[PDB]
Design an enzyme around this catalytic site. Sequence first.
Site, PDB file in Angstrom:
ATOM      1  N   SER A 114       0.891  -1.172   0.000  1.00  9.58           N
ATOM      2  CA  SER A 114       0.000   0.000   0.000  1.00  9.58           C
ATOM      3  C   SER A 114       0.935   1.229   0.000  1.00  9.58           C
ATOM      4  O   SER A 114       1.810   1.439  -0.817  1.00  9.58           O
ATOM      5  CB  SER A 114      -0.752  -0.316   1.371  1.00  9.58           C
ATOM      6  OG  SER A 114      -1.819   0.731   1.313  1.00  9.58           O
ATOM      7  N   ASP A 124      -8.263  -4.808  -6.472  1.00 10.04           N
ATOM      8  CA  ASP A 124      -7.674  -3.791  -5.570  1.00 10.04           C
ATOM      9  C   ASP A 124      -7.760  -2.409  -6.217  1.00 10.04           C
ATOM     10  O   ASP A 124      -7.137  -2.069  -7.300  1.00 10.04           O
ATOM     11  CB  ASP A 124      -6.239  -4.262  -5.253  1.00 10.04           C
ATOM     12  CG  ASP A 124      -5.650  -3.314  -4.195  1.00 10.04           C
ATOM     13  OD1 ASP A 124      -4.598  -3.674  -3.630  1.00 10.04           O
ATOM     14  OD2 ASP A 124      -6.243  -2.319  -3.749  1.00 10.04           O
ATOM     15  N   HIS A 140      -7.657  -5.036  -1.307  1.00 12.53           N
ATOM     16  CA  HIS A 140      -6.397  -4.390  -0.889  1.00 12.53           C
ATOM     17  C   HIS A 140      -5.793  -5.063   0.316  1.00 12.53           C
ATOM     18  O   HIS A 140      -4.581  -5.278   0.577  1.00 12.53           O
ATOM     19  CB  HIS A 140      -6.711  -2.863  -0.463  1.00 12.53           C
ATOM     20  CG  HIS A 140      -5.425  -2.131  -0.273  1.00 12.53           C
ATOM     21  ND1 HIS A 140      -4.405  -2.206  -1.255  1.00 12.53           N
ATOM     22  CD2 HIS A 140      -4.934  -1.337   0.701  1.00 12.53           C
ATOM     23  CE1 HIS A 140      -3.379  -1.372  -0.876  1.00 12.53           C
ATOM     24  NE2 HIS A 140      -3.703  -0.827   0.258  1.00 12.53           N
TER      25      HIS A 140
END
Length: 265
Positions: free
Chosen positions: A140, A199, A253
């Site tokens: 991330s 995602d 995610h």
Amino acid sequence: GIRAATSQEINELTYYTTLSANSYCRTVIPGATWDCIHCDATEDLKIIKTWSTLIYDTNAMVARGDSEKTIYIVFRGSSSIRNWIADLTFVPVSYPPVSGTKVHKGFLDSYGEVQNELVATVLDQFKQYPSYKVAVTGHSLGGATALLCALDLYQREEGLSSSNLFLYTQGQPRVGNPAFANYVVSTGIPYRRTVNERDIVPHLPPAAFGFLHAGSEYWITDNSPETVQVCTSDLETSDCSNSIVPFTSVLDHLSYFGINTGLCS
């Protein structure tokens, strides 16, 4: 171119885625250781260282392984885532280195613151070782731262481248523108871226514114079985885633393959 883847581648881527787842735781851162559951694967480775721162815171660481070787570185883314885515724113511125371218611132611132220281440581370781390768781665814111650281480483240059360184881454857313882427482618370185588926853261811122882326682518677508586717181319484308747217767732995610881434568871 476308283718486817393978297985281885686836394885580786787853381883780375575881470582882324472881771273866231615281323980480882811162614581550182380883412880846771787854651681174981781674444981082984060682551571070284661571751272945371314050312101822105851133855481881362470184470681280483060885074985493987380678170284480683781672871253873571835131813591818371848712717221852161728611717141875231862217611114652117420128770146520185380169120139033109642117881236845214815141882443650158864361780475620146651581660167330185771471681267330184681575370177130282480477230186020681150188061879180884370185590777770176863351887722991330762681882847853116781772781528721136680677571228730164490558640138520074040282050484470282392509080749070684580677781267781876787862768822883433874217841162720146184209231118730155281319540148881255250129450088080349390788681367681877882764885314887862649806995602838313880758685617842122737215485308438208411117821124673218570158680387390759782877885516786853478925578971079962597973487847883856682747585308390749580197740057851115458309084819694967863217385718568816617008548608776317836141858761885826946271775771781758299956584882848871842121827471640781």
